[PDB]
Amino acid sequence: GFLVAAIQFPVPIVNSRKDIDHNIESIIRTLHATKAGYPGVELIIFPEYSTQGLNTAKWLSEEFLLDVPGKETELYAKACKEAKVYGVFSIMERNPDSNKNPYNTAIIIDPQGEIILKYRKLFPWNPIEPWYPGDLGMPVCEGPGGSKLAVCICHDGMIPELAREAAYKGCNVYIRISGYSTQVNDQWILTNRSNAWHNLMYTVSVNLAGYDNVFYYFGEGQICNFDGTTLVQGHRNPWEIVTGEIYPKMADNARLSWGLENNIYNLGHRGYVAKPGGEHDAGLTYIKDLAAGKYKLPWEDHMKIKDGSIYGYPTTGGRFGK
Amino acid sequence: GFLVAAIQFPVPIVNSRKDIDHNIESIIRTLHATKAGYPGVELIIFPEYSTQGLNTAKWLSEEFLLDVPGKETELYAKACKEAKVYGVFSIMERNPDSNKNPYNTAIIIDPQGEIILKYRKLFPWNPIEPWYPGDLGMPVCEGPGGSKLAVCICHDGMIPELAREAAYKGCNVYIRISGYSTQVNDQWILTNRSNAWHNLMYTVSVNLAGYDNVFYYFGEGQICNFDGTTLVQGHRNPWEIVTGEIYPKMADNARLSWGLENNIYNLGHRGYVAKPGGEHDAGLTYIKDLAAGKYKLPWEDHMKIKDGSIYGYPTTGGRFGK
Amino acid sequence: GFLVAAIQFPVPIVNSRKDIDHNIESIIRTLHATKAGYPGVELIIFPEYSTQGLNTAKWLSEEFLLDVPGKETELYAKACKEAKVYGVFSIMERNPDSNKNPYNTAIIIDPQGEIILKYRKLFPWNPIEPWYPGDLGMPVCEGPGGSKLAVCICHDGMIPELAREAAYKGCNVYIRISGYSTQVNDQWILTNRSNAWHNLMYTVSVNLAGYDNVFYYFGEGQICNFDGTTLVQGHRNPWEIVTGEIYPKMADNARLSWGLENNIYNLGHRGYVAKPGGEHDAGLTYIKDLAAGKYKLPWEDHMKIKDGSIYGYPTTGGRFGK
Amino acid sequence: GFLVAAIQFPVPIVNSRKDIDHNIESIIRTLHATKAGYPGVELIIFPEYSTQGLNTAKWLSEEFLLDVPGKETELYAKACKEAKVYGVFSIMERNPDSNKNPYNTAIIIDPQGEIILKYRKLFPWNPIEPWYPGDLGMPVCEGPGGSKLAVCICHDGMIPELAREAAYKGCNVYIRISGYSTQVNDQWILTNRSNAWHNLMYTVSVNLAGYDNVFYYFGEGQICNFDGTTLVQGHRNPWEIVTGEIYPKMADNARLSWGLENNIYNLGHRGYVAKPGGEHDAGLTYIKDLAAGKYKLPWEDHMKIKDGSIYGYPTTGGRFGK
Amino acid sequence: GFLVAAIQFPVPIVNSRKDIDHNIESIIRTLHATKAGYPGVELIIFPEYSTQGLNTAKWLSEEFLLDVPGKETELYAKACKEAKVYGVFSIMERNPDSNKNPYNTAIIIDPQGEIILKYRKLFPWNPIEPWYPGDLGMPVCEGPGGSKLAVCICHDGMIPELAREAAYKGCNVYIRISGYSTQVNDQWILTNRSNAWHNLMYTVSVNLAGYDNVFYYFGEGQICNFDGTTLVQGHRNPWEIVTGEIYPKMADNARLSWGLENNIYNLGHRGYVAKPGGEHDAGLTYIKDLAAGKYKLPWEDHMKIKDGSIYGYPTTGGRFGK
Amino acid sequence: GFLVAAIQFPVPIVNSRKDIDHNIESIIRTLHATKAGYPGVELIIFPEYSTQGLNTAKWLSEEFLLDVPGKETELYAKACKEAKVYGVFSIMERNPDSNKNPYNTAIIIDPQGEIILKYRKLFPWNPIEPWYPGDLGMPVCEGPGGSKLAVCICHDGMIPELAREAAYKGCNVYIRISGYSTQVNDQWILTNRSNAWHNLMYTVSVNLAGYDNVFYYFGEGQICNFDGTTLVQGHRNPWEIVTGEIYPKMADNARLSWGLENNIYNLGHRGYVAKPGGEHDAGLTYIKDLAAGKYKLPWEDHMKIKDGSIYGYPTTGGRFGK
């Protein structure tokens, strides 16, 4: 067993690097205050956009971008080391390739102050977000109490194949950090439950409290059990700390022991009672197409939104918003 | 739009071919009565095991197995032609390959009395079910009111990749016929919603009212909108007819028009705003593994249930239970 | 199976025998209209006080009391014969013993116009009700679709021993007719479920819509399955007809077949696995006391309400309120 | 007022006396940890099977049986004395009659380390359980804050006459300890509420978290008020401590003061407004039959499950499973 | 009593007067179909924008504006006369004053084809709506079954003073027709209840199913009783007809008879028990200010949105958008 | 941000001044215990009737009446000063005009022990309450964390114009203290939400636990956000302390920044997009009538309850109950 905390962090309007700097210190203070309030906490999770805020007019500028690792990550690392916790942070990351747009990035730091996981948003929330598609796949790392942690970012949680990928690489606690999941709220709660059940793992998810100096009741905190049951649903309050005990080994034992419920095994081993080992070929043309890089929906040639021109982005490519 | 009916059919105990012919006449009587009571109905759906019941001591015997097509499906065809409806039926199907166990099969018959869809359960419920894993993939047919119909069977609905496959082939109304989906009731309801939302399609799902001559309140009927909202949830009553109006073209239009919510498009075109067309490589190791027939969970080594031995089934392959 | 209807009947203020005859014609009109609107209905149930209302200043007067049988029940009999339904009616009944207060009585009339069940409220609602405690025990009759019907009246439904008694005599559909079961609404719903589950029988229950010429949204209609699940809960509307299909034989089969859930059997055959037949002595001092007419709670000494003095009723016995 | 705690205790697989020994120490540690966490707690309740676990292959063997009192109870007593709490424990008890099967037993120990209540399961959960029917009736004892405590075991809570018996002997806080009440879950919650309302007493109930080294989310904790309202419903978590304040004197005052709600008085005093003292004869043939030891259901001669042969028990009698 | 129907009307995209005439014929077809399907219906209610849709680029153009009365309302009148129902329709109305923007208007037509009520939206939804604030106050008319009907439009229903005004003029059934009341869904449901309870009247309210050729599940239909209880809440389906029986005289009787609950009376007769007649001066500075045309919030000075500039509208007055 | 606490205070039967004295000390002890338990609490709220109880036979007597300020208020002031909190208290206040009935009064004391707000119930709960209508309007004061506080008493919360008045004078946290709001329970919860939403302010409300030495589960505690969402709903328990963090400046910023949601501004500025400044005349005859002191409902001449004669009060006027 271990105690997790998801922070419904309220981010003020961010207009400069100095605002970002104060925000980092706010996150750090919140981290220590949480560990003081909950002395047994081992994993503390901050929402998407909680470092740099949501200034859609400035968020592509060099002033608003960070390196991972960088001086800001080292401050987060120091705080994790002092508090002796795992921490999850959201950073809009300057692309090491200056000819590409920045990434939407998540890091897990351990109680030693080492970054043990770095994840780039694989499915940017299009057509609104300008972030370059992640190139680091879906990584998994060792966490507290026998957990194998993985993080996705917000809209990523809408993709069941991504939750499957985390599980397939060993994840038993799947973290989702979100920036604004309100107005897609039912579906966020829905997929947090389905991501858990489909894969026999816990899910721990958080949404940012707010970003606009006015309304800070958009926050969410949800912990789902490996059967898909919501164990904890937070109230929406600014600064709300949503907590619960997680037993990663119980998820592992379900995966080891269960028959009827073992859907993650059944996927690659269809009908193993009648056919020893199961049928290893799933069915399933989309799987073969996507592996080959030729996923194509039958209605693609009549679709309306296929680039960011509806929000004022170039449809050409390359770097922009400097 | 078209009106759909899902029948919470109660099957008695089945001890003979006499009892199976009785079920067939009962289903046909129910079909006509539903059309009489709901003149606008275009699609009538019967649950898994509604033809042959759930006699686990007899269900692999020749007496308990039918051909698809055969004289029995011809009777169902006659009824659909007479009622001028589409009908969905469950048949445990004799495998033409005598070295292999029977299939668990679903058919859709059109208002002309033609079988327009034949599907063999891809994911038998293991370790309890002895059905051979299906070999007809996930087919889609033309249905009423602009629908593209596909059917899965019970446990199939737990596999999110299979709902994706149906969608990828055009499905906008995904039918799940179920036989004993109680005791996993919460997870059944959950995935009926997630299957809909993930893929921007309707789901229409039904469970058998009962099978044991005693308890007939296991029935379910659930219709979900393409946003994942449950539109209709039936009461649990034997013989309950759960109906609802479906608008397949509205699902089509969502798929054509939506940007932020268009997860099915995003899967194969990740981050198309900064990279034109998006990245066609999703991630994503399990997809590539499964496509190649080499999906392997890291913990398969220590798993307890990988054959039907717990239920007394032989573990070496071939035809059994005759 | 048979279809049942419970009528959320609204009674006006009753100030005369003229008003009572008006209620009688209104109930009869409602009975015919229900049969017209629901051609399959076999059992129609009216609430407590639906014949004579709730005029606490007149309800013990000769003008406000009827004989059972009498010309009024003969009119109800005529209606049931004409409609070919079973009907349940409430009558405040003149006590043939002139030294005793009237009874609060319910009858069931069959489709032949015969009174096949007569029940006098065993547990008048005290201290407010002046009705003489019933002396006809808890009778059971033959009803439609294989049912064994029994009726209790309102406050009667709070006594779990009485639901047991009905069951012990064969009842598989237990009817509760109620007159002002608001303000105890939660406990009414609760016991309708527990009465069903405890005894493996259906419960069908109705409350009067209102009685005071102003507020007619006190009505309830609730049908519970033999497992205690509420199958139907009506909206609160005056004149609302709450209907549902009942399957009395399914309750019979549960009682015949069930082991773990068969609490009604267990009561008189405790632990039959280690002791054949079980122990026939349940425990159990109150049972023996009550059987002997000597049930006495340890705190009776200090109880505040043991007569009708709070309501102005005489405390010495005999006929009053004439 | 006093604070109660119900422990959703997780029991590991038990294969030997040494496993039982470690389990006892686990319970003891949990007891002290609870009192440390909740300094005001006065009553701490452990679930059914929490001492010896659930090893249905070994639970009738001498190695798996204890005496009450015995060295194991004295360890529980010592812990209660040190912590200064009342504690409730579950013990499968070797029958002092070697020709009879063991009992399913519950004890209450006071803050002095004295066993002040010993209860043997009156209604073993047949046909699965081998325990001999209890012979100690339904005892009641003095507890904290003016409570009169009684305990039933699991399936016992399904019998309303047993809750009535506790109340009749003075109980105002009725404790139910359960081993696996999941899958009869709705009905457990239902009867915890009805047992309370019927008798104007609090109910405090707990279910074992799990028993199989895999799944530990079967736990329940429920506190009902004397009006039947659920005051506290725990989340299901291993090790969850469900707490609430109980005011036993408030239950007593309701019993002393109430009229309309006083169903427990009405049972033995039907219609006391019309008939001074009420009618002392309830109605009620089953009551007379059960007092005489001749409770007989009309359908008994056609029942299917009347001995433990469906699970592999002798139908002869005597001691077995050594 | 009378039966009411609220239509969850789906409007396509409207790009022309051709499309508006199409909506008109669609509404008329719907009106007849509703009467055919619900023979007892006396009042049929269509949502805001159901005639002309929600084309914010064209909605102020002459092509998109109608006269009230005009040839279009005459067609609606013909339909109501033919169907013998009362109908409620939404019309964006050309302002006869050419220096002023059009009104957002609702009419009620009686079964004789007469316009018996004309209302211009008093509270346009600002800053998004350009409609001139209504100048016909809050009128009330005679409706079916003893009703006094009044209609407000969408955002109007957020103003509790306006529901009071309708009531003060006699209204006992308050109709709210709405066009895009999603995203404020919780507050819409809430105020429909509070408008009813505050004033002891029924509320009947409807929202448009959709307007954008894609999503038509925004529809709502809600009927609240005069105590504030929701009697009927429709499912969200395009074309859904939400019906319910209304009893206007029961609301009248509450207003006549009730004491404690009679808040509408209390407002103008505060504390009439110690001061005969009550105090006629309510308090109460805003009432006096608003009456005098000088309502001013203390923070108006620092408010951000006090004109339509955020939406591109001119801020200086006069007719625009032609 | 600041933490509020509402106390579900249980008041015993009060028969003398000495009982009142002990009750005051009980309130004081509760105040200190709350601040000790919740060290960050800044505002502590006691329910209506919590000082003098509810003795309807004695509550108009001089012995049962207090002065405000007086020696009893000074004891409350001392406690607030020592604990360094704002406190809200209920006092039945002797009228300084001996020819008038006493007031139902509420006070707010600050952490300096100064009474900073005094409010007399404007709308006594007629026809039951004898209190003289309040003459101090609806005052507002400065509270903790940038709040502007106002209090209403119980039935006052049923009047939306009163909540509007508080807001209009700057209130951003509207407190409602209630004596017995049960049986008007739904409507209390309803209006706590609507009072919040209508005015974009928080509401914090509490009901007295009980008053009769028997039942103390009538308590309520509810905190609503400025969007009308219930943030905290207490369980009903005697002595329950319902707490939550309030961010008064967030309410202020919503009022400053919002457009579509800004109903409080729209009331006095109807249609400001089309007409610069909005239309300042609301509509609205009742407003003009009430400002002029001639509020008159159309049905007033046929109303039944217009004085306290139904409960035994003089209909003449003046002082009574001495």
Domain harbouring E45, CATH code: 3.60.110.10
The answer to whether the CB atoms of E237 and B231 lie below 8 A apart is yes
Method: X-ray
Report helix, strand or coil for D317: coil
Q: How many domains does chain B have?
A: 1
Q: Are A150 and A179 in contact (CB under 8 A)?
A: no
Cα(E213)–Cα(B257) distance, rounded to whole angstroms? 10
Q: Which residue has the tokens 């039947």?
A: D228
Q: Is residue D230 part of a domain?
A: yes
The token duo for B51 is: 């033809």
Mutate to test the interface with B, among E8, E185, E233, E237 (most CBs of B within 10 A): E237
Q: Are E212 and E231 in contact (CB under 8 A)?
A: no
Q: Are E267 and F161 in contact (CB under 8 A)?
A: yes
Rounded to the nearest 5°, which phi and psi values hold at E222? -140, 130
Q: Is residue B181 part of a domain?
A: yes
For residue D213, give the nearest of D12, D8, D10 by alpha carbon: D12
Q: Which residues in chain A have their CB less than 8 angstroms from residue F247's CB?
A: 216, 238
Q: Which chains touch B (3 or more CB pairs under 8 A)?
A: A, C, E
Residue E5 pairs in a beta bridge with: E44, E243
Indicate the residue type of F110: D
- Confirm or reject contact between B57 and chain A (CB < 8 A): no
Question: Angle at Cα A300 formed by Cα A297 and Cα A302, nearest 5°?
Answer: 145
Q: Is residue D52 part of a domain?
A: yes
Cα(C87)–Cα(C143) distance, rounded to whole angstroms? 10
Closest chain B C-alpha to A51 CA, distance in angstroms: 22
The token duo for E8 is: 């969850």
| Residues found in chain E | 322
* Rounded alpha-carbon distances, angstroms, from residue F167 to A32, F147, F264: 38, 12, 8
Q: Known catalytic residues of C?
A: 48, 121, 154
Q: Which residue has the tokens 């409507």?
A: F187
Cα(D199)–Cα(D251) distance, rounded to whole angstroms? 9
- Closest residue in A to F227 (Cα) is A217
Rounded to the nearest 5°, which phi and psi values hold at C75? -65, -45
Cα(A277)–Cα(A273) distance, rounded to whole angstroms? 8
Q: Are E246 and E4 in contact (CB under 8 A)?
A: yes
For residue A198, give the nearest of F57, C217, D91, B191 by alpha carbon: B191
The answer to whether the CB atoms of E287 and F263 lie below 8 A apart is no
DSSP states of A185-198: HHHHHHHHHHHHHH
| Sheet-wide strand order for A230-233 | A141-142, A148-153, A173-178, A202-207, A220-224, A230-233
Q: Which residue has the tokens 């589409």?
A: B86
Radius of gyration for chain D, computed over Cα atoms and rounded to the nearest angstrom: 20
Q: Is residue A303 part of a domain?
A: no
Q: Is residue F316 part of a domain?
A: no
Cα(C59)–Cα(C52) distance, rounded to whole angstroms? 8
Choose the closest CB to C217 out of E227, E253, E258.
E227
Closest chain A C-alpha to B45 CA, distance in angstroms: 24
Closest chain E C-alpha to F204 CA, distance in angstroms: 18
Report helix, strand or coil for A116: strand
Q: Is residue F310 part of a domain?
A: no
Query: What sign does the dihedral A141-A146-A150-A154 (CA atoms) show?
Result: negative
| Sheet-wide strand order for E141-142 | E141-142, E148-153, E173-178, E202-207, E220-224, E230-233
Cα(D216)–Cα(D54) distance, rounded to whole angstroms? 13
Q: Is residue C193 part of a domain?
A: yes
Specified resolution (Å): 2.0
Report helix, strand or coil for F84: coil
Burial state string for B219-242 with b = 16 or more CB within 10 A and e = fewer than 16: bbbbbbbbbbbebbebbbbbbbbb
Q: Strand locations in D72-208, DSSP E? A: 86-93, 103-109, 115-120, 141-142, 148-153, 173-178, 202-207
Burial state string for D146-185 with b = 16 or more CB within 10 A and e = fewer than 16: bbbbbbbbbbbbbbbbbbbbbbbbbbbbbbbbbbbbbebe
Closest chain A C-alpha to B31 CA, distance in angstroms: 31
Q: Which residue has the tokens 């200043």?
A: C57
Closest chain B C-alpha to C254 CA, distance in angstroms: 6
10 Å CB burial of residue A293 (0-12, 13-18, 19+) is exposed
10 Å CB burial of residue B127 (0-12, 13-18, 19+) is buried
Residue C80 pairs in a beta bridge with: none
Q: Annotated catalytic residue: which of A154, A165, A171, A224?
A: A154
Number of helical H runs and strand E runs in chain E:
7, 12
Q: Are B126 and B133 in contact (CB under 8 A)?
A: no
How many Cβ atoms from other residues are within 10 Å of residue C2's Cβ? Answer: 19
Give C86's contacts (C-beta < 8 A, 6+ positions apart): C42, C43, C44, C80, C108, C109, C110, C111, C143, C144, C149
Residue C223 pairs in a beta bridge with: C204, C232
Cα(C60)–Cα(F165) distance, rounded to whole angstroms? 52
- Give me the helix-helix angle, F71-83 and F17-37, nearest 10°: 10
**First and final C-alpha spacing in chain B:** 46
Q: For every residue of chain B, which 3-state class applies, written as one string?
A: CEEEEEECCECCCCCCHHHHHHHHHHHHHHHHHHHHHCCCEEEEECCCCCCCCCCCCCCCCHHHCECCCCHHHHHHHHHHHHHCCEEEEEEEECCCCCCCCCEEEEEEECCCCCEEEEEECCCCCCCCCCCCCCCCCCCCEECHHHCEEEEEEHHHHHCHHHHHHHHHCCCCEEEEEECCCCCCHHHHHHHHHHHHHHHCCEEEEEECCECCCCCCCCCEEEEECCCCCEEEECCCCCCCEEEEEECHHHHHHHHHHCCCCCHHHHCCCECCCCCCCCECCCCCHHHHHHHCCCCCCCCHHHCCCCCCHHHCCCCCCCCCCC
Checking B212-218 for CB contacts under 8 A at 24+ apart, the result is: B212/B13, B212/B54, B213/B12, B213/B13, B213/C253, B213/C257, B214/C250, B214/C253, B214/C254, B214/C257, B214/C258, B215/C250, B215/C254, B216/B10, B216/C247, B216/C250, B217/C225, B217/C227, B217/C229, B218/B180, B218/B182
Question: Angle at Cα F203 formed by Cα F199 and Cα F205, nearest 5°?
Answer: 145
- Confirm or reject contact between D122 and chain C (CB < 8 A): yes
Mutate to test the interface with E, among F129, F140, F290 (most CBs of E within 10 A): F290
Rounded to the nearest 5°, which phi and psi values hold at C176? -125, 115
The answer to whether the CB atoms of E256 and F299 lie below 8 A apart is yes
- Confirm or reject contact between D142 and chain C (CB < 8 A): no
Cα(D251)–Cα(A101) distance, rounded to whole angstroms? 69
Q: Are B220 and B206 in contact (CB under 8 A)?
A: yes
Report helix, strand or coil for F166: helix
Report helix, strand or coil for F189: helix
Residue A222 pairs in a beta bridge with: A205, A233
Radius of gyration for chain A, computed over Cα atoms and rounded to the nearest angstrom: 20
Cα(B298)–Cα(A250) distance, rounded to whole angstroms? 16
For residue D245, give the nearest of D43, D31, D34 by alpha carbon: D43
- Confirm or reject contact between B294 and chain A (CB < 8 A): yes
Q: Which residues in chain B have their CB less than 8 angstroms from residue A271's CB?
A: 122-124, 126, 131-134
Choose the closest CB to C227 out of B213, B217, B235.
B217
Rounded to the nearest 5°, which phi and psi values hold at B167? -60, -45
Cα(E45)–Cα(E67) distance, rounded to whole angstroms? 20
Q: Which helix (H) or strand (E) holds E90?
A: strand E86-93
Query: What sign does the dihedral D77-D79-D82-D88 (CA atoms) show?
Result: negative
Cα(B295)–Cα(A82) distance, rounded to whole angstroms? 42
Cα(D219)–Cα(D235) distance, rounded to whole angstroms? 8
Q: Is residue B108 part of a domain?
A: yes
Q: Are A70 and A76 in contact (CB under 8 A)?
A: no
Cα(F111)–Cα(E210) distance, rounded to whole angstroms? 54
Report helix, strand or coil for F163: helix
Q: Are C169 and C40 in contact (CB under 8 A)?
A: no
Question: Angle at Cα B126 formed by Cα B125 and Cα B127, nearest 5°?
Answer: 140
Indicate the residue type of B259: G
Name the residue range of residue C208's domain.
1-294
For residue C31, give the nearest of C74, C106, C89, C71 by alpha carbon: C89
The answer to whether the CB atoms of E266 and F310 lie below 8 A apart is no
The answer to whether the CB atoms of A216 and F254 lie below 8 A apart is no
Give C261's contacts (C-beta < 8 A, 6+ positions apart): C200, C227, C254, D184
Q: For every residue of E212-238, which 3-state class applies, written as one string?
A: CCCCCCCCEEEEECCCCCEEEECCCCC
- Confirm or reject contact between A265 and chain B (CB < 8 A): yes
